[PDB]
Amino acid sequence: GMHALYITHPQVKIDPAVPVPEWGLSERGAERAREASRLPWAKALRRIVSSAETKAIETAHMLAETSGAAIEIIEAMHENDRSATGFLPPPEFEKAADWFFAHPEESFQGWERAIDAQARIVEAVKAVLDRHDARQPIAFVGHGGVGTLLKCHIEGRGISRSQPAGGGNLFRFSIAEFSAAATCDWTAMETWQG
Amino acid sequence: GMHALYITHPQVKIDPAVPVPEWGLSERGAERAREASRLPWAKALRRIVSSAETKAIETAHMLAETSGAAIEIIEAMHENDRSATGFLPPPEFEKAADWFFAHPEESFQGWERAIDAQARIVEAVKAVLDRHDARQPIAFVGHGGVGTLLKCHIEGRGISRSQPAGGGNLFRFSIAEFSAAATCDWTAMETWQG
Prior knowledge:
Two copies of one chain form a homodimer.
Chain A: E1 3-8, H1 27-37, H2 40-43, E2 47-50, H3 54-63, E3 70-73, H4 90-102, H5 114-130, E4 138-142, H6 144-155, E5 169-174, H7 175-178, E6 187-188
Parallel strand pairs in A: 1-4, 2-3, 2-4
Antiparallel strand pairs in A: 1-5, 5-6
């Protein structure tokens, strides 16, 4: 277990009454996670480290259905904080997201700065990996925004935007190297042959 | 002036500091509105009735640049109210929007009910048209969500989803008929030859 995976949650089930942060995976999202869980790479996992959001925890549990991998919840793995903005329609959100990545040292509308979200996710992954038993294959389960920031850090490139639509995407990275520049393209978890 | 137009605002300019409700049109959005303003149908307008949102008012002003049409602001023309939800990422927003239209007699997460938003926009357009001088060509400038609900009412069809991407779309309707079932497909305002 000297390479780690970072996996984004797949599709989310909306509800008119259940609090938004508590939403779980859709029928399709859950299906995809279950499909991934039966793959050799998923069966080999011994620890899955999830953000504390319901959709992430559900993904982790689904991925662990065959393996029975231990699940650890890390609050610090939360998505880029963007609660300050209130509601934003998609066209405006997309430009705001572009802005977030384009101006990492600045806050969009009270949103977490991209530089700060990157520092946070890198620190959280580092803390976990620092105390990691190298023998146990490990995956992180979380979110595309911070996942992208992590990916930038790992590759030694500047912060820039662009996972594919639908979530449930992963990349693999070297644990040893995470501790100078080094990862695969985002790929659908349920089709990953690694 | 016995047919009226309903026109959606085009693309919006984001800003990291200016309050979100106060955002105006982007360079591109403003360009498109100005282009439309120089068209014969726009030159012929004598009254433009806008919602109170900055993006709508800017659209109205841009559309009136050649005509000098009178602009009336109507608070009741506001977009479907969806402030209660807080921030929603696009994939979840799209399903929530689908839900909004699919279940018009129910509230999504404290959002305005589609049946209520439809009643509101129909009542607002009716009030304006009731006191309208039939000689003066008129356009309403506003939002795609309530615009869709208005369009459903006019056509005598049930509430259902689906304007094209980028906004700045219009349809034309008979004022006389607005007062049983009767409209063109949504079409880009700057290309409209009507």
